[PDB]
């Protein structure tokens, strides 16, 4: 979308400046806690082999991007639901009300919800979200990470090997980095271009740029079908 192109531009400016190749990196000067995201994926389970990918957002809401490209979201009130068609057309409803055509998917979502709640850790549990519902537009995995694209423009990348995570927010042109110790820091990308960053964050930002392009390529392919 438009956010993807904005994010690509933001990442370009930083990466082109080679932030880790500076005389004296001052990463801390680019910090801005006020730019912490409102939403990010706290956990996910990939059962795309049969039903789809379930996930939980940091506000405790749950969602599932089924294999037929449709999405069902269950708000943290445990009753309000939002259904998004392949097109993107959304519809509001609740569990209490029994929209017959959605009972199967609602039931599937609940099993996903229970599994995640019982077996998985909540990423960013030590983070207080920013004051304010998006759905998972698309996702894919590489040999080293899972890429998650939210409908609000945010792109999240979870790295498998060291459990580090990147949350890119185009509206605020910012990025939140969670290290393996679960410590988190939020940076304004424009300040990173100015003050630089360590080689690790630099490497991940280069990879992120590559992942954003892959999202654009997938979208161009998916568009050819619609």
């Amino acid at each position: 979308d438009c956010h993807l192109s904005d994010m690509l531009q933001q990442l370009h400016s930083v990466n082109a400046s080679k932030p880790s190749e500076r005389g004296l990196v001052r990463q801390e000067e680019a910090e801005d806690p006020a730019c912490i995201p409102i939403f990010w994926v706290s956990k996910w389970v990939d059962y795309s082999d049969k039903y789809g990918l379930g996930y939980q957002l940091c506000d405790n809401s749950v969602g599932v991007l089924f294999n037929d490209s449709t999405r069902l979201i269950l708000y943290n009130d445990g009753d309000s639901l939002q259904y998004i068609e392949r097109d993107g057309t959304e519809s509001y409803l609740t569990v209490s009300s029994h929209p017959n055509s959605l009972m199967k998917k609602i039931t599937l979502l609940k099993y996903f919800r229970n599994y995640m709640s019982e077996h998985l850790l909540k990423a960013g549990a030590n983070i207080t979200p920013r004051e304010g519902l998006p759905y998972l537009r698309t996702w894919f995995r590489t040999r080293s990470a899972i890429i998650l694209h939210l409908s609000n423009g945010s792109v999240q990348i979870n790295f498998f090997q060291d459990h580090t995570k990147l949350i890119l927010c185009p509206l605020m042109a910012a990025v939140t980095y969670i290290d393996e110790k679960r410590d988190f820091r939020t940076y304004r990308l424009s300040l990173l271009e100015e003050y630089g960053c360590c080689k690790e964050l630099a490497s991940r930002l280069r990879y992120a740029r590559t992942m954003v392009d892959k999202l654009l390529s997938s979208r161009s392919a998916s568009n050819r079908l619609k």
Binding site: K43, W44, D46, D49, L121, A123, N158, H163
Partner: peptide
Amino acid sequence: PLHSTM
């Protein structure tokens, strides 16, 4: 089969 950190 595949999931985030347990």
